């Protein structure tokens, strides 16, 4: 009946706007930084300077005489067996990918992958089967261990 | 003015200084760095009569 107000998305005019914004930001940074940067006899004769240098040389000669709280572990607490210790390493993530670092054991992940593969080879709150697609067993460390 | 052992600063200062002041600065550098044979040779180049 009546369309609601929509701003036209121009992919390449937005680039011009971004470039103008970047130029304005650079100019503002230059103006701000020049204030912090623009704040800063013996200059015309040499014999006086050499006398001062010799005096300073004489002066120098005279003076000659453990805690990892908050680090998630992407494994169930029950996965770890008493009586032995085992090593955790960081899971691979992209550098630009802004996300929390998780601690991972390669052997435990291999075991979980094998379990998932076994389950999928034998299986042949709303709409659960496709909830995994749109969207995990981790615990948070506190003052070291938990 | 920081008394550097480098000869490059002394060499740059001397080549644009007055010859008497140049040789005095060369003597000062030799006092700072006796091993600077370049400064001694330059002073000997102005050894006069």
Owner of token pair 């503002």: A28
**Which structure tokens are listed for A49?**
């300077």
**Which structure tokens are listed for A93?**
């993530």
Q: Kindly state the helix (H) or strand (E) to which residue B38 belongs, with its residue range.
A: helix B37-45
Question: Which B-chain residues 18-47 have CB contacts (< 8 A) with chain A?
Answer: 18, 21, 24-25, 28, 31-32
Is A89 in a helix, a strand, or coil?
strand
Please tell me the distance from the alpha carbon of residue A103 to that of residue A72, in angstroms, as a whole number. 6
The three-point CA angle A26-A29-A33 to 5° equals: 140
| Residue A103 DSSP label | E
Is A121 in a helix, a strand, or coil?
helix
Chain B touched by A58 (CB under 8 Å): no
Interface test with B, best of A46, A58, A64 (most B CBs within 10 A): A46
First to last CA, chain B: 32
Please tell me the distance from the alpha carbon of residue A74 to that of residue A123, in angstroms, as a whole number. 25
| Residue B15 DSSP label | T
Chain A touched by B1 (CB under 8 Å): yes
Q: Evaluate whether B20 touches A45 at the Cβ level (below 8 Å).
A: no
Is A112 in a helix, a strand, or coil?
helix
The three-point CA angle A72-A77-A79 to 5° equals: 115
Longest dimension (CA), chain A: 98
Please tell me the distance from the alpha carbon of residue A104 to that of residue A102, in angstroms, as a whole number. 6
Q: Which chain A residues are within 8 Å of B24, Cβ to Cβ?
A: 46-47, 50
Exposure letters A83-121 (e unless 16+ CB within 10 A, then b)? eeeeebeeeeeeeeeeeeeebbbeebeeebeeeeeeeee
What technique determined this structure? cryo-EM
Give long-range contacts, CB 8 A cutoff, 24+ apart: B11-19: B11/B38, B11/B39, B14/B39, B14/B42, B17/A46, B18/A46, B19/B46
Chain B touched by A56 (CB under 8 Å): yes
Please tell me the distance from the alpha carbon of residue A80 to that of residue A139, in angstroms, as a whole number. 12
């Amino acid at each position: 009946e009546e369309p609601v107000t929509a701003d036209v998305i121009n992919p390449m005019a937005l680039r011009q706007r971004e470039e103008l914004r970047e130029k304005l930001a650079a100019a503002k940074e230059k103006r701000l930084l020049n204030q912090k940067l623009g704040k800063i006899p013996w200059l015309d004769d040499t014999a006086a300077w050499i006398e001062r240098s010799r005096q300073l040389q004489k002066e120098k000669d005279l003076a000659e005489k453990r805690d990892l709280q908050g680090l998630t572990v992407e494994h169930a607490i029950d996965s770890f067996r008493e009586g032995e210790t085992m090593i955790l390493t960081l899971k691979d993530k992209g550098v630009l990918q802004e996300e929390e670092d998780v601690l991972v054991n390669v052997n435990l992940v291999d075991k979980e992958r094998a379990e998932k593969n076994v389950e999928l080879r034998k299986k042949k709150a709303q709409q659960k089967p496709r909830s995994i697609l749109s969207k995990p067993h981790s615990f948070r460390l506190e003052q070291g261990g938990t | 003015e920081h008394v550097p052992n480098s000869v490059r600063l002394w060499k740059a200062a001397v080549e644009l200084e007055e010859p008497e002041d140049a040789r005095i600065m060369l003597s000062r550098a030799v006092e700072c760095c006796p091993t600077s044979v370049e400064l001694w040779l330059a002073l000997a180049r102005l050894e006069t009569y």
